[PDB]
Design a protein around this ligand. Structure first.
Ligand SMILES: C[C@@H]1[C@H]([C@H](C(=O)O)[C@@H](C)O)N=C(C(=O)O)[C@H]1S[C@@H]1CN[C@H](C(=O)N(C)C)C1
Ligand code: NA
Ligand code: NA
Ligand code: NA
Ligand code: NA
Ligand code: NA
Ligand code: NA
Ligand code: NA
Ligand code: NA
Ligand code: NA
Ligand code: NA
Ligand SMILES: [Zn+2]
Ligand SMILES: [Zn+2]
Length: 259
């Protein structure tokens, strides 16, 4: 379950399909009028993602949007390649747009000094908090969830099976991690951002959460359960509350260690 590892794709619920690697989530939200891809994994992982979308029966050329959670190599490293293979437009939080274009995270990132650059993407555009991304019958809402990066977005939609619908959340990372030289206690905008994001995420309507690092919401344990119990295994309307609580815990542990 390395970041670039192959992973057989699978449907989580309705038109929501996992197409990521063994280590990094990516989701295809499908329709007859074309598809939305959330995240690209790594540069090497783009070849996995692309094969996975085809394995689920879909054409790359029908992927119209690529939505970015945030602009680090593990989630975004494959976006450029995917953008070239699909022709899609890439959508991201305002403050991450320049990072996706260049593949270089800025000094405001707590991990600056320890991040690896990744390929820059074409066709990157900003979305605002609350904004809807529409494609045919698809409707995906952007929620600003800054802190791990300034432009982090958590994306939400509804998927249905014969009219039984669930609220699905692709949860951006909420983790306070840094370079050795970085003190969170000196950076109030990042701390405030993280706290506001924990609050936003724990309030989301959230039947199925797919975390950017899938194991954050126990994806693989859930998939193993689904073999027997079906896709109810992915459903847990407390999962966004749990991702938020873990984020909060990680930040409070860190602030205490900095005293
Ligand atoms: C530092 C991490 C990782 C990246 C990394 O491993 O370098 C970094 C670029 O940000 N990505 C991260 C993120 O939260 O998006 C964070 S924490 C994440 C949650 N549990 C994962 C883990 O512990 N693994 C060994 C896979 C990593
Ligand atoms: Na694969
Ligand atoms: Na489908
Ligand atoms: Na994993
Ligand atoms: Na590109
Ligand atoms: Na974003
Ligand atoms: Na950024
Ligand atoms: Na661009
Ligand atoms: Na961080
Ligand atoms: Na259930
Ligand atoms: Na978390
Ligand atoms: Zn990251
Ligand atoms: Zn990550």
């Amino acid at each position: 379950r390395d970041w670039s590892s192959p992973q057989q794709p699978f449907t989580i619920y309705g038109n929501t399909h996992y197409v990521g690697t063994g280590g990094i989530s990516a989701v295809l939200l499908s329709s007859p009028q074309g598809h939305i891809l959330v995240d690209g994994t790594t540069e090497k992982g783009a070849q996995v993602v692309a094969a996975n979308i085809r394995a689920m029966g879909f054409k790359l050329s029908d992927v119209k949007y690529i939505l970015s959670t945030h602009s680090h190599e593990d989630h975004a490293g494959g976006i450029s390649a995917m953008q070239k293979l699909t022709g899609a437009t890439v959508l991201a939080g305002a403050a991450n747009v320049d990072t996706l274009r260049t593949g270089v995270s800025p000094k405001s990132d707590p991990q600056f000094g320890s991040l690896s650059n990744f390929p820059g993407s074409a066709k990157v555009r900003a979305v605002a908090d609350g904004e809807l991304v529409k494609l045919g019958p698809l409707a995906v809402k952007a929620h600003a969830t800054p802190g791990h990066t300034e432009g982090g977005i958590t994306w939400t939609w509804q998927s249905c099976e014969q009219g039984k619908c669930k609220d699905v959340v692709f949860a951006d990372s909420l983790t306070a991690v840094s370079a050795d030289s970085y003190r969170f206690s000196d950076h109030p905008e990042v701390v405030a951002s993280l706290r506001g994001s924990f609050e936003a995420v724990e309030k989301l309507s959230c039947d199925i959460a797919i975390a950017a690092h899938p194991e954050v919401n126990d994806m693989w344990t859930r998939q193993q359960r689904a073999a027997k119990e079906g896709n109810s295994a992915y459903v847990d309307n407390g999962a966004c509350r749990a991702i938020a609580a873990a984020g909060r815990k990680r930040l409070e542990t860190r602030l205490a260690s900095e005293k």
